[PDB]
């Protein structure tokens, strides 16, 4: 059977983890207590066979965000053995999360993973939810990702990361924590999907006309993106895209695995009635840059490979018409060596709506994850951002004191510059 273990590391992972596991429960009819609604039914309740514990791990060194889940509305859903806290947070330090403080917690994390791997019959992949801006999401994220490659082989490791914005920051040491974690994301992930914080802010400002977006609103439509791509495993459809189908069609080379994301219909409740949501209409909106979840230009790069997860009442006819309209337009540019670049996946289940959510009930939805050479555009912003700070060697005595050597900064810079050269190398076109 298909089955996926998703690990959530850091505060940003578990706030998404609170949002995504809220959406999974409403999709399958699971109540927050965990019970799906003759004498066997009385036997069914007391044996716990109607309880559905998630295949998830909430680990974070900071206790004040994980106990909120422990005392929240989903206290009965999660096993208390699956929620891992810590004495002291990594606190915006990749050295603390990877060497000193994250060392004594990751061994307890693989113990929880081994218990979750024993319950599953045949495992298919791993999902990592973290932010490289913070200490725990980057540091403990890299440590957990490094150990999971050793203990488990042939099992995919899908990476969901929240990279820092070029303009928006909640901290100062994002360039250090992002660059060091990126070297782990080159090496140990299988497919990495980019998420940008203020790109969702511009989505909620424009598409959902909310002038006051907070982290609860951003994580809600983040939870739209995660469930949409894995929706082929939950429900049947005309064209299924498994978690191994995702890798074999979307990454051309092992280094090239960082990917963008997009969700096409993002319409408020009032705006929904006047808008005609057609397959051809939203597919044009899917490739629109302001509807993308990463602040980047699709026109800057060339789409090496792309996938389309369609949900709802979508026939295979008009989605193929939407394929051709994208290819014939001059603004959207493909790379020359990939003529057939689109993977089409259709699920028959319409997308669920969370109660009190800003997203409206939409019949048909598109989730667009594409591999582009304009993701090194994002890296080049963080490249000189890290290089300007490291030139004067500020914020280094925190990393040096906590076990890390000085040469780790140059090695992660060396790996990141190799990927910068990589995207120009593969972004080359052969023209006679």
């Amino acid at each position: 059977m298909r089955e996926v273990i998703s690990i959530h590391i850091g505060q940003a992972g578990i706030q998404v983890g609170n949002a995504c596991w809220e959406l999974y429960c409403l999709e399958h009819g699971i109540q927050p207590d965990g019970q799906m609604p003759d004498a066997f039914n009385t036997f069914f309740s007391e044996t716990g066979a109607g309880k559905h514990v998630p295949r998830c791990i909430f680990l974070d060194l900071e206790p004040t965000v994980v106990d909120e889940v422990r005392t929240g509305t989903y206290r009965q859903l999660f096993h208390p053995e699956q929620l891992i806290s810590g004495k002291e947070d990594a606190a915006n330090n990749f050295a603390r999360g990877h060497y000193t403080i994250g060392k004594e917690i990751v061994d307890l994390a693989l113990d929880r993973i081994r218990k979750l791997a024993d319950n599953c019959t045949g495992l298919q992949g791993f999902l990592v939810f973290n932010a490289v801006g913070g200490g725990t999401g980057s540091g403990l994220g890299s440590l957990l990702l490094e150990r999971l490659s050793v203990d488990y082989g042939k099992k995919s490791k899908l990476g969901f990361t929240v990279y820092p914005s070029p303009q928006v920051s909640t901290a100062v040491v994002e360039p250090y924590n992002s660059v060091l974690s990126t070297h782990s994301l080159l090496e140990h992930t299988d497919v990495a999907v980019m998420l940008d914080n203020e790109a969702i802010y511009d989505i909620c400002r424009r598409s959902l006309d909310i002038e006051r977006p907070t982290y609860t609103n951003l994580n809600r439509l983040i939870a739209q993106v995660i469930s949409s791509l894995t929706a082929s495993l939950r429900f049947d459809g005309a064209l299924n895209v498994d978690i191994t189908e995702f890798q074999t069609n979307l990454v051309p080379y092992p280094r090239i695995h960082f990917m963008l994301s997009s969700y096409a219909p993002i319409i408020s409740a009032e705006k929904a009635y006047h808008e005609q949501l057609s397959v051809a209409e939203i597919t044009n909106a899917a490739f629109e840059p302001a509807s993308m979840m990463v602040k980047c230009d699709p026109r800057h790069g060339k789409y090496m490979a792309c996938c389309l997860m369609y949900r709802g009442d979508v026939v295979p006819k008009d989605v193929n018409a939407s394929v051709a309209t994208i290819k014939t337009k001059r603004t959207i540019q493909f790379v020359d060596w990939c003529p057939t670049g689109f993977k089409c996946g259709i699920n028959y289940q319409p997308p669920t709506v969370v109660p009190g959510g800003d997203l409206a009930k939409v019949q048909r939805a598109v989730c667009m994850i594409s591999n582009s050479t304009a993701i090194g555009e994002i890296f080049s912003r963080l490249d000189h951002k890290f290089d300007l700070m490291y030139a004067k060697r500020a914020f280094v005595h925190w990393y040096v004191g906590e076990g890390m050597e000085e040469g780790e900064f140059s090695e992660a810079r060396e790996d990141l510059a190799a990927l910068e050269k990589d995207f120009e190398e593969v972004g080359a076109e052969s023209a006679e």
Binding site: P166, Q167, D202, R206, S278, V279, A280, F287, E288, P289, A290, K295, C296, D297, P298, R299, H300, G301, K302, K317, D318, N320, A321, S322, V323, A324, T325, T328, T331, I332, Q333, A374, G376, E377, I378, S380, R381, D383, H384, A417, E420, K421, E424, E425, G427, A428, E429, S430, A431, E432
Partner: protein, 166 residues
């Protein structure tokens, strides 16, 4: 009966080891054919590699060798700064409209590495391309005339003469 049994056993046993046996002749023919096809397979792989892949990657890696990383980060910094300036000034940026004076995102696609790939003659396409070689000294527009795939959607399916009033 005994003499016939001896003769039959003699020939069916000596055929397994005799170098002049028809079994030995068939084994020699099969081994010769297997060696010939293995050598032809290896020769085809090596000649395709040396004539196409080595040349194309030599040109591409030479172009990347000539290219310098620092100029690449400077150019992508300028491009990203232009994009953030446009998103800061304008009330959202939309893909369909392009103001050339304001913002030219196609310059990024224009400033890309170019590899000639005109001198290369593909060894795998020898029999297919011999005809166009001898006519002269990718293929042409091929397929049958069909409906435009832009018209396959639910909107133009009523505008096209097929299914106009159905």
């Amino acid at each position: 009966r005994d003499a016939m049994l001896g003769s039959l056993l003699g020939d069916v046993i000596g055929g397994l080891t005799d170098p002049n046996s028809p079994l030995a002749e068939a084994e020699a023919a099969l081994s010769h054919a297997d060696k010939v096809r293995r050598k032809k397979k290896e020769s085809l792989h090596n000649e395709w590699s040396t004539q196409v892949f080595d040349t194309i990657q030599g040109r591409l890696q030479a172009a990347v060798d000539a290219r310098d990383p620092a100029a690449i980060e400077s150019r992508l910094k300028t491009q990203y700064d232009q994009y953030l300036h446009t998103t800061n000034t304008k009330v959202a940026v939309f893909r369909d409209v392009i103001i050339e004076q304001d913002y030219n995102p196609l310059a990024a696609a224009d400033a890309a590495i170019r590899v000639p790939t005109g001198d290369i003659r593909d060894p795998l396409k020898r029999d297919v391309l011999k005809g166009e070689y001898e006519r002269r000294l990718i293929y042409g527009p091929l397929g049958k005339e069909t409906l435009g795939t832009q018209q396959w959607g639910e909107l133009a399916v009523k505008a096209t003469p097929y299914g106009h009033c159905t």
